[PDB]
């Protein structure tokens, strides 16, 4: 089962660096969002039905740095830098929430039941759900839980992000064929890396590939949450980079 | 326009996984079947090459249906009727969505690119034309995996197959799938006019392919040795 060629190892170092350079620290230094913030001590109705404005405002406080790390990750890929600006824009819009969600999910902590967003803010499922994500909180927690057994490393996470980045079916793309070829290149190196890694579970490759489909739906589902957030939250709490990536 | 409920997201995830897990990888992994195999009834050489891949083609549809808990809760008997009813419908949608306008080939199973003439002469007759033309229509629909998945679930849960024991429970599932599909499409905003009417009509085109195919199959049985017919092909298509 082939292992990475030399050129593939080089692509691997490029993507791995791009990712670790934009993925600050994570255990220790992590502060918990105060337990009062977006959680009733005793839950009496299904959660996530209206946006808790206080929780929401704490999340939007760290969302600018969060989005910029995704943007800096992409800009360190020599393949992304060959695309024209309009395709760059559309691909960042398409994959932003998919990569953010992946990252948060790999920071799942089984003992506290928390995700640590940005490597700095630990949140529970209720707090993330109530502060705007609704059911997307479940999808990210659940994905986080199911990913522990995959034992992902930096390279594997980086590679998934580049697969997600290079999706040629975002609406509006001009360089559809070039983007798919880059995706295929990333995917071929990825599979070869997985062949080298030898995780001890059957059909690991297709099992891991499936997570790309899940992260796609999470992104689609969040696009609906953004709309509900737009109607329920006052405008002043939406940072301009938040609006720029998730609008339109 | 309403968007998916939380419960509709959960079905969407279920059906979409079902489909992507059983739809193997394709821009390139594909191998053009040599242009001398079905040049221009029933070319025994071309046909032989299609039945070689038909067994994997059907167990894919089978596995797709078996990853839907709604399907696995119905009685065995109904499952068998649903799957025979829809097999060729779904196979033809998958082939059609892999239509390549540059080569004017469909890619079967994501592995065997063929032209209109090969699939035609290899046994499908005019059904090849109908898959190809559906392949041309769908181009500008840009269905994603969820949309194809949902379509496939609509074809599956067709409550009018003859002999079905649980008519109303299959209709009710088909309505769950139809409501999630519309809601999903409402938020996807494709740039064709009357997108939803036009997509639903694709279902009626597909149901006809399957009907037409059931009749092509009897011609195939007349004209090709029974030995070339893999036992799963026979099991899904034969009375
Ligand atoms: C703010 C935030 C950041 C990440 N994230 N993003 C980049 C990164 O490098 N690491 C990380 O955890 C992950 C998630 C799930 C995240 O939560 C949200 C994502 C999207 C979103 O709209 C909201 C509103 C509730 C503000 C929160
Ligand atoms: C072999 C074949 C497979 C599919 N198909 N089935 C499942 C799938 O996942 N993808 C796919 O293309 C679709 C078509 C249209 C197809 O061609 C045939 C369908 C039916 C049929 O009877 C024949 C005979 C000529 C052998 C060929």
Tell me what the structure shows.
Chain A: It is found in: Nucleus. Chain A: This is Thyroid hormone receptor beta. Chain A: Residues 7-248 form the NR LBD domain. Two copies of one chain form a homodimer. With 248 residues, chain A is mainly alpha-helical. Chain A has one domain (1-248): Retinoid X Receptor, CATH 1.10.565. In chain A, 61% of the residues lie in helices and 4% in strands. Chain A is built from ten helices and four strands. Chain A has helices at residues 6-20, 53-61, 63-75, 85-106, 125-133, 135-147, 154-165, 176-197, 204-232, 240-246, and strands at residues 31-32, 108-109, 114-117, 121-123. A four-stranded mixed sheet of chain A has the order 1-4-3-2. In chain A, α1 packs across α8, α3 (63-75) packs across α4 and α7 runs antiparallel to α8 (176-197). The longest helix of chain A has 29 residues, at 204-232. Chain A is globular and about 55 Å long. The relative contact order of chain A is 0.17. At the A-B interface, α8 and α9 of A face α1 of B. The structure holds the ligand Cc1cc(-n2ncc(=O)[nH]c2=O)cc(C)c1Oc1ccc(O)c(C(C)C)c1 (2 copies).
């Amino acid at each position: 089962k082939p292992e990475p060629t030399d050129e593939e190892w080089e692509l691997i170092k490029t993507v791995t660096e791009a990712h670790v350079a934009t993925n600050a620290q994570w255990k220790q230094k992590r502060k918990f969002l105060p337990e009062d913030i977006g959680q009733a001590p005793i839950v009496n109705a299904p959660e996530g039905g209206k946006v808790d404005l206080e929780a929401f405002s704490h999340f939007t406080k760290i969302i600018t740095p969060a989005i910029t790390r995704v943007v800096d990750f992409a800009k360190k890929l020599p393949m992304f830098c060959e695309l024209p600006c309009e395709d760059q824009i559309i691909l960042l819009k398409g994959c932003c929430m998919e990569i953010m969600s992946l990252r948060a999910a790999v920071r799942y902590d089984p003992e506290s039941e928390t995700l640590t967003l940005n490597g700095e803010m630990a949140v529970t499922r209720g707090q993330l759900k109530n502060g705007g994500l609704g059911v997307v909180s479940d999808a990210i927690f659940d994905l986080g839980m199911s990913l522990s057994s995959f034992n992902l490393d930096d390279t594997e996470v980086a590679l998934l992000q580049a697969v997600l980045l290079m999706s040629s079916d975002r609406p509006g793309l001009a360089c559809v064929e070039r983007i798919e070829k880059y995706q295929d290149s990333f995917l071929l190196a990825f599979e070869h890396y997985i062949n080298y890694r030898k995780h001890h579970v059957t059909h690991f490759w297709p099992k891991l590939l499936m997570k790309v489909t899940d992260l796609r739906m999470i992104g689609a589902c969040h696009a609906s949450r953004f709309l509900h957030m737009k109607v329920e939250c006052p405008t002043e709490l939406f940072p301009p980079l938040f609006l720029e990536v998730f609008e339109d």
